[PDB]
Design a protein around this ligand. Structure first.
Ligand SMILES: OC[C@H]1O[C@H](O[C@H]2[C@H](O)[C@@H](O)[C@@H](O[C@H]3[C@H](O)[C@@H](O)[C@@H](O[C@H]4[C@H](O)[C@@H](O)[C@@H](O[C@H]5[C@H](O)[C@@H](O)[C@@H](O)O[C@@H]5CO)O[C@@H]4CO)O[C@@H]3CO)O[C@@H]2CO)[C@H](O)[C@@H](O)[C@@H]1O
Ligand SMILES: OC[C@H]1O[C@H](O[C@H]2[C@H](O)[C@@H](O)[C@@H](O[C@H]3[C@H](O)[C@@H](O)[C@@H](O[C@H]4[C@H](O)[C@@H](O)[C@@H](O[C@H]5[C@H](O)[C@@H](O)[C@@H](O)O[C@@H]5CO)O[C@@H]4CO)O[C@@H]3CO)O[C@@H]2CO)[C@H](O)[C@@H](O)[C@@H]1O
Ligand code: PLP
Ligand code: PLP
Lengths: 808, 808
């Protein structure tokens, strides 16, 4: 139907229908009289999967022939979402399948909604891994994604009485047609035991063994016939144990890959989590060595292998590589260390202290005896280096140590990663600068060459073509289809900023997206929004640093002003906030309840009418993001300056036609820099302002006494205006805002409200609002993960990206 | 190659090769350069499975159209074994696939050995369920096998230092291509809770819920295009639960279908086992009712439904049916009871007291509150009936009660089954008689019409055509192929008893089978047997009543006689004993060690040479039975008269050309009756003799004092002749034989040894031994499970069997 969805040839459609019926019959063992939409979704999925296998097999064969340098991306999270439509898009099969299903009397869009999201991630960090795999395949890199196949991903969020309830995400219930179990490649992982020191070196013995079974999922590049692999490990117990209990206790070993820890930017030192981290690391490294030996001196190891650590979660890769090289291969320490540093690279994702991994020594000592010895040895040699470079600087030695002293000794995994990696990067310019100015300043001074920046990005395939066909289409009509795999070309759209036709089309697509979402909202949630109002949306994990609370304050302010002057005109808005809170993050759960509570007052106030609506989007996940983002007008990125390392949701909104209101934080800075500050709604303290406020001391009371509108809001919360039956329900919120606000919500309130008035003024002028929108879209090319990946490839991994098509 | 394996048409072979390559590519995602035998086995399996689906779908459709009476076989065990070859046989695809694989350069027999046995059974009872499903499909009955999909079947037995070691049977590791998960038909099962009595009747509330997910496996009839279904339930936890632990505790609910209790003819009142029994029953009945309502008065229920209980394991079906009819459908008690009795039938499998299920009331009270109330109510009305028929007979009331009084009240599940069933049958004439003369005498006097006999049988497909192609072939050359689905025809072979050619062929096939097994024994076990010796084999679960110990005594006697007169001629023998012992059956584990210990002395004694060898066949299972049975000369069926209800292994040996030495027990009686006593080696006490011995009192000492050869053997065991480093290792064995032998091993020793001398005398005359063999094979037709099933169908279920071919 639309150009970018590919061609629908008669032979292709005919063959697709044939294979669809074959799978429904032979694979699902069903007939058209008993089949359900679910059965139809699976028949189509297996049909599309088939077109993938041929390419998957020759791609891997190609890598065996050419034997290029291999990139290994280690992450405990891969927030994939659905893969049916994405596969059709990358294979140019969308229109053919749409026609083929149409002729079979089926609605393809209805079938796509049946697929379960592969929610093996928490948010930012995990989605980045997903976008990265896509870009790596699209750039012809011999890359492999390695992780854990959690049988339960991020929990499904339900709202009961305004509160969040967690439900197990049993995403494998009906099966996963995309993965291929490879039980023949199972590997053993060791735990516990003890260390014996012989004349032949150290030996790790009397260990408990857990098997790692791999499941491979194909990762298709964009129309280049390249299909890479994402290998996920599953835990299995050895078969060799009264008898019944021994068999039942197998679950203890298999619990390792049972569930994803639902923590976003927060560390929890639990033993099960440490086992998961070592489990993925140990199995992946054996696989890497095995594949390498099929290519015995490891001097060439770094020339054939690149290991990228997504945060510190897979940090044990460093001492595990040393263990294998030293203990098993028998290389001398110094040589093994050279190899390790040259193959490992580390990416930091946050600077907040509570997110930093610091494992108690007594834990590593019991679970991984040998690794702790190796870490201590790495530390000694590292401090000897620090001592020799900064003679007499004793405090520097204690600050840089990988071992933190105190009541309980801990291992700072971030320090371990810096020491054992040849490259350390932040995820946005301002974040990377902050890393060498503060948190890792001592390390930067010792080895300035290791620090780099690699600004995050998102894939234009899933985040434009797949979720916003209408926009991709009207862009293609004017500049072609080349931008899809080279986003910088969108810059050519700057020529149509005055084109009356384009302006009308951009505005038309947005309205259609809003209508479609307003409908979806009513269908699956029986809510009630006005498609003409401004869609003000803030979707991301619930966090105090992300400041959904600042957003709440604005909402209440709008409401109080309306009640103040009921018959005054105000731009209509539909404020949508969505996101999950970690199960044990009390404050985050309280913020969700506040949001729904505000909605209960505002949405049922007759005087407000349909001028203001506050909706809480439940179970925010990748598939939901693909729906709400294209329909948004205003993107809320209001974290306190210096806290959001980069952000990626911000980029998604920019690419889909929404204007951005936000602080100079993370990538917001580079976005505004790319679009021009006049085309962004920047407000609030800059990083320097937050620093001055801390030096002096943050006194929330001051803002409370000087801003009557703010005072009124706080008093309403305290008196129980938003919780009649529970007058003090929100006392924790008020107390935190007034006395223990680490994120200075009040400090940015005034400027935020003023800035919000200016976006309202611009929305009243449809033509000008849309022209500013065109200006944002036209300059968002830099935030394509293809650019990001090409920089990692050239500046860290030492490989050259390719657009060369692979033989079909 | 051989006639009975079907035709190998050019088009069929061509199509098979094509589909084989398609599955290797698209399904296994492999290429001929990386594929392993395992991959090849799977490619072939999926290819054969395909030919099954078309028939599977129309068969079920056919039943929907015709709506015939449905047979539901409830069993907690289905000892299936491998299904690849059996499927080819029933579909006449064996030769085509053999050729197709040959042309692809593969050995089909090698690929078949890769398939894992579906060992979801313990022995007799479970294999009977498997043979039954096969016969029911072959006789065109609308039958469904219902059970539990254990993820761990009967343990794999390994021998270490002569001792049995149990290893988890992870049969699903590489996947099961035969099953089809049907998560869309998941059903809820309730546990615990309490009972509320309202004005609207009883209500079972506050229950814990466990989901039952079904997996369907196709069951093809023999060349009739009928494919029935075996539905196995798997336990799954509901999704609605700190957070992590709640997700991990899901394993508690899913443990229900984790493993098969490895007990053969022995009861263990564990809670997990009771949950398994209710789990299979509750899910199956909802499925039965649901399917019935798609055919509201239940007066016609018994006309459309037959429920067969394989032993008392699924006995809760009776009170569960009452619960649903009374509590949910609201039928009056009396009406519901009439329906229940008319749809349920019970099959008893043993008379040994330790095997009888007697569940403690406090257990049923906690786990199934409502069912216990229903059982009490069933009991009261039943005893009122007994009281009215036998006025004043108070002791009769206590004996017939379903509730056993004492320190701990228990529910006799066998009494529950008799009361709620319209038919109760034994599994062999002598067993069924024993049921009404002793154990169920009171019940037989109250309702003589309920008692019947249904002598067990085995399927001639798996137990002749599949495991002994050579014999089936030479039989077919002379009388055609019709006998395969009508075993009585083998009786026509009696005409060739004097045919010199036939005699030579029968003897040739046996020798080839022995050579092939002697080879297999050396390949996978590096053992060392002489193909010319007599193959004396006893394979079955290890039990004191089966008397492997009596066999051991003969072995030692042969050995002692050889040492006595070294240069005397004796017919060479290879004594093979195999079978698993339940993990907690100490005595059974001791018997295995004795057997291997005897082998250590006998097999390494230079004077004996290759005149006597004692081998312990480890990990005896269905696939192993298919190999050793065809190669046997002598079948050992020596249980103490009155203990082996029927036996089925005995039948397998008779059909495959082995002569039988055994007691007048179980089906041995009917076999000897069919072949003629002169063609059987019967010895020992009859049931009447065991009774007289008990009245008088069994004194093992008497036999010890009167039989010097027996005394010598006992003294060797005591002094440590078979355990030098552990002189008293077998003190438990000796003590049991001498003072607490419930099975009177010594009482049959003398006659057993004498009878064994006569089989040796006959083996010295090849021609006559073979003629007696032909006489056994020719009269084994009665023991076909097709005959058994036709009798159940006509005398219990009320349906007529069919040989009508179904449209291809
Ligand atoms: O096998 C070679 C090696 O073995 C032996 O050394 C090992 C140690 O026995 C073992 O304990 C481990 O040493 C760790 C140490 O346990 C751990 O606490 C850490 O120590 C650091 C501090 O973390 C760091 O702060 C700094 O300490 C300062 C302190 O901060 C300051 O306030 C004040 O207290 O002075 C302290 C020292 O001046 O430095 C120490 C270490 O200098 O890290 C240690 C090393 O990682 O591992 C050792 C080697 O593996 C033998 O004893 C040794 O001879 C052999 O060379
Ligand atoms: O709702 C209708 C019904 O409810 C109530 O009756 C119920 C009982 O309250 C309840 O306990 C249960 O009764 C069971 C009984 O608990 C259980 O022990 C069993 O009793 C049998 C013995 O098993 C049997 O041996 C025999 O007992 C002899 C005994 O052997 C002999 O040695 C000597 O002791 O005398 C005894 C009696 O003469 O018979 C008893 C019963 O006669 O089975 C009972 C019934 O299954 O369930 C009852 C009904 O569900 C009300 O009390 C009653 O009025 C209502 O009709
Ligand atoms: C892109 C995305 C995120 C990251 O959003 P931020 O606003 O950077 O935190 C989180 N969750 C989902 C489902 C996403 O698609
Ligand atoms: C047939 C069979 C049995 C039953 O044998 P009996 O001698 O009757 O106990 C047990 N196990 C297997 C594997 C069988 O094939």
């Amino acid at each position: 139907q639309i150009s970018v969805r590919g061609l629908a040839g008669v032979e292709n459609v005919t063959e697709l229908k044939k294979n669809f019926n074959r799978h429904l019959h032979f694979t699902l063992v069903k007939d058209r009289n008993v089949a359900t939409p679910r059965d139809y979704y699976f028949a189509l999925a297996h049909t599309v999967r088939d077109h993938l296998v041929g390419r998957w097999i020759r791609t891997q064969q190609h890598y065996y022939e050419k034997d290029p340098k291999r990139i290994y991306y280690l992450s405990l999270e891969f927030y994939m979402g659905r893969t049916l439509q994405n596969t059709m898009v990358n294979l140019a099969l969308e229109n053919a399948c749409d026609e083929a299903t149409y002729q079979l009397g089926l609605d393809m869009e209805e079938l796509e909604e049946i697929e379960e999201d592969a929610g093996l991630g928490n948010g930012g960090l995990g989605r980045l891994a997903a976008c990265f795999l896509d870009s790596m395949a699209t750039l012809g890199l011999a890359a492999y994604g390695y992780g854990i196949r959690y049988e339960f991903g991020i929990f499904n969020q339900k709202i009961c009485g305004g509160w969040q309830m967690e439900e197990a995400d049993d995403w494998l219930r009906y099966g996963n047609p995309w993965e291929k179990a490879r039980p023949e490649f199972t590997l053993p992982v060791h735990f516990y035991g003890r260390v014996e020191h012989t004349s032949q070196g150290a030996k790790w013995v009397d260990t408990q063994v857990v098997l790692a079974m791999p499941y491979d999922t194909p990762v298709p590049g964009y129309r280049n016939n390249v299909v890479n692999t994402m290998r996920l490990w599953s835990a299995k117990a050895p078969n060799d144990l009264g008898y019944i209990q021994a068999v039942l206790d197998r679950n203890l070993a298999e619990n390792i890959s049972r569930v994803l820890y639902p923590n976003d930017n927060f560390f929890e030192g639990k033993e099960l989590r440490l086992k998961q981290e070592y489990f993925v690391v140990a199995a992946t490294l054996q696989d890497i060595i095995r594949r390498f030996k099929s290519s015995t001196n490891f001097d060439a190891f770094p020339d054939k292998v690149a290991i990228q650590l997504n945060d510190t979660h897979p940090s044990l890769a460093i001492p595990e590589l040393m263990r294998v090289l030293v203990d098993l291969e028998r290389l001398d320490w110094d040589k093994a260390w050279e190899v390790t540093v040259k193959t490992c690279a580390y990416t930091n994702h946050t600077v907040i202290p509570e997110a930093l991994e610091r494992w108690p020594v007594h834990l590593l000592e019991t679970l991984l005896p040998r690794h702790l010895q190796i870490i201590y040895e790495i530390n000694q040699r590292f401090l000897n280096r620090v001592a020799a470079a900064f003679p007499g600087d004793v405090d520097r030695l204690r600050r840089m140590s990988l071992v933190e002293e105190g009541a309980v000794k801990r291992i700072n995994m971030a320090h371990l990663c810096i020491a054992g990696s040849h490259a350390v990067n932040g995820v946005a310019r301002i974040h990377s600068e902050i890393l060498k100015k503060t948190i890792f300043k001592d390390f930067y001074e010792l080895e300035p060459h290791k620090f780099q920046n690699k600004t995050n990005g998102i894939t234009p395939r899933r985040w434009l073509v797949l979720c916003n066909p209408g926009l991709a289409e009207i862009i293609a009509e004017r500049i072609g289809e080349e931008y899809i795999s080279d986003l910088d070309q969108l810059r050519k759209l700057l020529s149509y900023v005055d084109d009356e036709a384009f302006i009308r089309d951009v505005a038309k697509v947005k309205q259609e997206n809003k209508l479609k979402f307003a409908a979806y909202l009513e269908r699956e949630y029986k809510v009630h929004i006005n498609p003409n109002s401004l869609f003000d949306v803030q979707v991301k994990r619930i966090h105090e640093y992300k400041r959904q609370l600042l957003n709440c304050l604005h909402v209440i302010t709008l409401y109080n002003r309306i009640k103040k002057e009921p018959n005054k005109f105000v731009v209509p808005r539909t404020v949508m906030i969505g996101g999950k809170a970690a199960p044990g993050y009390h404050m985050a759960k309280m913020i969700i309840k506040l949001i729904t509570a505000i909605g209960d007052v505002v949405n049922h106030d007759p005087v407000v009418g349909d001028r203001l609506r506050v909706i809480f989007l439940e179970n925010y996940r990748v598939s939901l993001a693909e729906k709400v983002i294209p329909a948004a007008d205003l993107s809320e990125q209001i974290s306190t300056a210096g806290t959001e390392a980069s952000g990626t949701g911000n980029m998604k909104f920019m690419l889909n036609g929404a204007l951005t209101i936000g602080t100079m934080d993370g990538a917001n800075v580079e976005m505004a820099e790319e679009a021009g500050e006049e085309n962004f709604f920047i407000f609030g303290m800059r990083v320097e302002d937050v620093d001055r406020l801390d030096q002096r001391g943050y006194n929330a009371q001051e803002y409370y006494d000087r801003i009557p509108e703010l005072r009124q809001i706080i008093e309403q919360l305290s008196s129980g205006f938003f919780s009649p039956k529970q007058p003090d329900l929100f006392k924790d919120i008020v107390n935190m805002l007034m006395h223990h606000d680490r994120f200075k919500v009040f400090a940015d309130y005034e400027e935020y409200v003023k800035c919000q008035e200016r976006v309202s003024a611009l929305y009243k002028n449809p033509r000008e609002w849309t022209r500013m929108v065109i200006r944002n879209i036209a300059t968002s090319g830099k935030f394509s993960s293809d650019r990001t990946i090409a920089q990692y490839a050239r500046e860290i991994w030492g490989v050259e990206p390719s657009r060369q098509r692979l033989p079909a």
